[model samples]
Every structure is written in C-alpha cells, then in structure tokens.
Target: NSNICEVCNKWGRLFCCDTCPRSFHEHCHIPSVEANKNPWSCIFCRIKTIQERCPESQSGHQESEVLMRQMLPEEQLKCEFLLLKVYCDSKSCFFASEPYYNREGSQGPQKPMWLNKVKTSLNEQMYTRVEGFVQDMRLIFHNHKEFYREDKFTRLGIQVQDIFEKNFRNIFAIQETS
Candidate 1:
C-alpha cells in the first residue's frame, strides 16, 4: 500500500498542523508537534482555497474577501506583534513582531504585499521556520527552548502552551483590567 501520511492514516497517530490543525503523517509532516504547535494555518492558508476563502470583497475588486466567510471577532483586529509557537526541541525562545502590518486596505501596501522580511532561523534538524511581518500578514514562529526566563513567565509558558495563545491574550484588545 502507498505509505499514507501518518497524521491522516487509517491506522496511526493522527498528527495535525499546529497552525491549521489539518492532520498529516510523520512522513508527510514537516515536523511533529512536540514542544509546540505545528502546521499553523494563517489567513493565507485558511483563505487560499474556494472552501476557506472569505466571501465579501471590500471594493468589489479582488475576490479575496468574497472568498472567505465572516471573520472571527479575533481576526478583525490587527495586532502590532504576534507570537508563534514552534513544535520541537526546548531551549530557545523566539518572538515575532510587526510595528504595523495590517493597516493597509485590500489594495494598499499593508496586507501581504506590504509585508517585509525580519528574522528567521532553522533548527538542528534544519527544520526551518520562516518569520517576518507583512501588511495584514499573519506571521507565525516559535522558539525551540525556554528562551524567556521570567519566573512567572515560566508557568505562563506552560499554561499558555504556544506563542499564538500568549500573544493572542496579550495583544488582542479584549479589554483592560482596572
């Protein structure tokens, strides 16, 4: 039989992308979700296909918005810096930030076109993780190990689990505590 993707195999551990949570197999996976979430699906990945793309074009020009459905409340806002989670090893900490990447409109230089390369690194296995900020670009990344050494942050790291969670909680404007 054809070697199936371990994640989606009929009889094997179902592994999914940490980003999109789409399942795959070990041979099919870029890397397993060991210490962090793997296979992250940004707006681009989610909206790439006819099934997942948005449904309303802002200017009735490009069908990008028309491709996707309604945006999640959390997706509507553009956070300055976004945190990403890596899926292997445990020692380093990686952080990704963009001063203002999503302010530009559909044709404006803010969304994907406006994105600029920042920093990226590969792991010991040469499993690569590319990081950068683009206009309205959904950035993803991860630090292999515990790079941040704050005592409370330690527990926070465990509880938070991934960069998306940590930054999502901090950056997204949920409301302020008084």
Candidate 2:
C-alpha cells in the first residue's frame, strides 16, 4: 500500500505493514532492517507505569521533574534554551511529518507527538505552566520510543532526550543530593 522504504527511500519491492504506514524493502532494512519488514506492525504504544519511592541509589530523576513542574512561566530563557538544543540535536527534517506518517503510531487510537507540534504549542503559549511544557517535550520522545522501539529513529530520539534531560537539570540547577 505504500511506496518507498523509510530508510533507503527507493521505490522497490518493499514490504508494508498493515498496522503501520512504513513500507520497507526486505533486503533493505539490514541491521536497521530490524523494522516491520518482518511483521504486520511498526512500533506500538506503552502501558505507562509509575513506581514511586524505590531506591536510595535513585536520587536524581524525580527531583528534576518536580522542579520543572514548579516553575513559573516568566523564566522564558531556560525554556527557550531547552528547545533550542533539541533543534540543533535533531539535525534532520524527517520528524517534522512523523506525527501523521504512521497508521498505528499516529492515526490509530494513539496520542502522537513530535517536535514541530511542541514548537507550535510554544508559539501559542498554550503551555501555560512549566510542567505542561515539560510534559509536551517528554511526550515527543515518549511517542517516539513507543513507536520505534529500536529503529535508528528511536536511538535518535533517545539521543535528543538525554540532551534535553541534561539541560533540564542544568538550566534549573537541579543539583545532586547533598
């Protein structure tokens, strides 16, 4: 039902997933070929689990989330800086259209998000509180992970996320526990 491979971009004998929009050439996927070239689905959704208060060794992540959630809207510099790093790290135009590209990842009973949408939200200032902004940023990567699993795109998503997380902590001075 689809044409070119998302990777090679060649319109050859590609295998398309019924549950997803991406079509792939069987020989084309290779190591990255670990795509839906072998199945009826692309990457899918996550059943979110929140496990609170576990390890004393786990003394970092929770602190940053709370700090961002508590932020006032006036400190635009940090938010602006955070978003800019994502853009530079992105380095590709592919994700701009990813939200609508997947049959399951986007069009199905799913909540699809991408960086462009995040930027749009910023432009409108609908991200009225700090955590809403933070949530949307996380949401972009969450959907990416939920859908791609282990694609090159998924790793790219992870790379950008760690960038965001590092800056998130730094910009807010979310320091290590004393």
Candidate 3:
C-alpha cells in the first residue's frame, strides 16, 4: 500500500516507479504531466541509470546539439557586405545623383530581379541580421545634399566607390586589432 508521495511528501494519489520503490504524485514527478502515461523512475534513479549506461565516455559527452548553425560574427558581417555589393552592382534603377528618378512606368524605381534573387538566395536570415544596415543606407540617401537636392545629374551605378573600399579595409584592420 502506498503511504505518501516521495516527491511532495504529501498524502495523495501517487504513481509508483517500476525501477525504484519510491512513489510520486503525478504532478510532482520529473516529467510531471506524463507520469502516468509510461513506466518511469524517479529523478535520482533515472540520472544514476543514465550515468551507469554510459560509463566509458561519460566525461566527454556532448551537452547539446545544433540544428541550424549560425555563421561566425565576422563571416556574417562579410556576407552582409557582399550582399550589399551585389545589390549595388546589379541594380540599374538608382543612378549617380537622383535615385529612382522616373525609370519604369512606376513613380519609384522598381527593384531589379537579380537583386531580389540574390536576397532570396541569402535566405531570411539576411533580413533579420542586416536590416539596420539597409535602414542606415536609406538615411544616408535622404541626408546627403547632392542626392536630396539634385533634379538632374550624371548617371552612374549605385555601387560603392573607392572611399567605401578604403574604409572597408580600414574597418577590417581595426577588427583584426581588436
């Protein structure tokens, strides 16, 4: 006859473990809700059993597993720059001074298909990671005097110039130093 719950130490409807003599309340069991569904041992007994089952490489056991492994910080930032470079090179809508100025039938410049393809290929993770960077770019376009005030200017791709390349190298060097 069951006396009291070994877990809660209270008089209640107890579920007994097949492996050990200890009894537990259904709500007080290790996996509380599923206690009555299967034959289960108490927490202490279960831990001891697991340790005994794998005595050979117990010290070298892996803690957790990875599903979708994330890229390293540097690698992730590099990918973001590469994606931006791809956009600048392929997108034909934006020119030198006035961005998105009366290109297609629409009021604003329609994004090139290749740019969208590149973004899609990078997966949804890119948006989650580098959304702020794009937002900053928008701010730059809006704030710059030449870009904001000009109605007509020389046509050029939206690609990064020599200054951007030099700054990129400088940033990389700083990262290496840190």
Per-residue lDDT for 59-86 in model 2, tens only? 4555545545534443343464466555
Q: lDDT order of candidates, best first?
A: 2, 3, 1
After superposing candidate 1 on the true structure, give the runs of residues whose Cα lies further than 4 Å from its correct spot.
1-9, 18-21, 32-34, 38-178
> Which candidate comes out best when scored by lDDT?
2
Error of 1 at 121 (Å): 16
lDDT of each: 0.30, 0.56, 0.41
Cα lDDT tens digits for candidate 1, 48-96: 3322344331122222331242323223222222312222212112222
TM-score of 3: 0.29
Could you give candidate 3's per-residue lDDT for residues 101-174 as a string of tens digits? 44333343233223333334344444333333343343333333233344433223223333333333332222
Q: Please give the distance, in angstroms, between residue 149's alpha carbon in candidate 2 and its true position after superposition.
A: 2.4
In model 3, the worst 10-residue window by lDDT is: 60-69
